[PDB]
Design a protein around this nucleic acid. Structure first.
Length: 209
DNA sequence: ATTCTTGTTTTCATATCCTAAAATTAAAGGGAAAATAAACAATACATAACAAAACATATAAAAACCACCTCACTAGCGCCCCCTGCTGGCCTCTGTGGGCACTGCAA
């Protein structure tokens, strides 16, 4: 949580090297990134959640995610994993996903996908001298595509699980600012758009905040 | 009457021209691997602008240095008794020199 971004990024790289050894032995593949299933990376997500819980020096993981951005690029785009570890009760036999842990994971997702859309660091870490390379912009575009197609699917039953949670709805409705809407015209998923519209209508008529 | 030169058509002849079948050869068409070039994007280098640090000047601020004044000390030479001891006449009291009257003795 240093104000100076290079110090924070170095600390986050150290943290990623240290506290992530569930199935990655910091060695070769075929057991390190993913074991071909929808399960190994769950525990990495788990001590991300626990680290955000214990880090009481911040109500938001914005600085933490920004520090852990470039070191864990492949891990932070695997949104489907903690998506099943948030909604549909995975086959790992773990405990119930705690409400405080649910809010922590949702805040982590807010941070990760907003840094996925816009690459500029937050205020205090800001520079203003940013130039976009071709690789940067193509990663941004296909990142936008994959998050759009993933989360037009996930947000309906996300809301259906968390309709009454005011702060979780407020956190979850910042991502649609970063959705390319013509993909809906190409993806033909306006029906899921309308389902989410009815769902957020239910939230609006159920919430007065 | 018989013999001899000269000019002009006839017909083989020998080079040439034309004709067509082979062959053939170069053009030319297409498949494909190099391949230079070019369009775009990234990195590094150089230039310009802004802000701050460093250098130089002025000024005055104690502050140091030098010279003059002043209040003493240090020499200096009379100045003035003052006391003490020798010296050179001075004078008068003893004392040195002498004239002479006087006496005791024994003629």
């Amino acid at each position: 949580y240093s104000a100076h971004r290079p110090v924070a990024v170095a600390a986050g790289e150290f943290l990623h090297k240290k506290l992530f050894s569930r199935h990655d032995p910091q060695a070769e593949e075929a057991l390190a990134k993913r074991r071909g299933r929808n399960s190994p990376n769950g525990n990495l997500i788990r001590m991300l959640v626990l680290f955000f819980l214990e880090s009481e020096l911040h109500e938001h993981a914005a600085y933490l995610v920004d520090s852990l951005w470039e070191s864990s690029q492949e891990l932070l785009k695997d949104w489907e994993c903690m998506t099943e570890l948030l909604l549909e009760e995975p086959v790992q036999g773990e405990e119930a996903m705690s409400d405080r842990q649910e809010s922590a994971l949702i805040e982590l997702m807010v941070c990760t996908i907003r840094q996925a859309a816009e690459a500029h660091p937050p205020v205090g870490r800001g520079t203003g001298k940013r130039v976009l390379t071709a690789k940067e912009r193509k990663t941004q575009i296909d990142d936008r595509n994959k998050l759009t197609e993933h989360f037009i699917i996930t947000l309906p039953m996300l809301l259906s699980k968390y309709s009454a949670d005011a702060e979780k709805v407020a956190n979850l409705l910042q991502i649609p600012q970063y959705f390319d809407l013509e993909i809906y015209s190409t993806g033909r998923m306006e029906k899921h758009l309308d389902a989410l519209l009815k769902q957020i209508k239910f939230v609006v008529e159920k919430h007065v905040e």
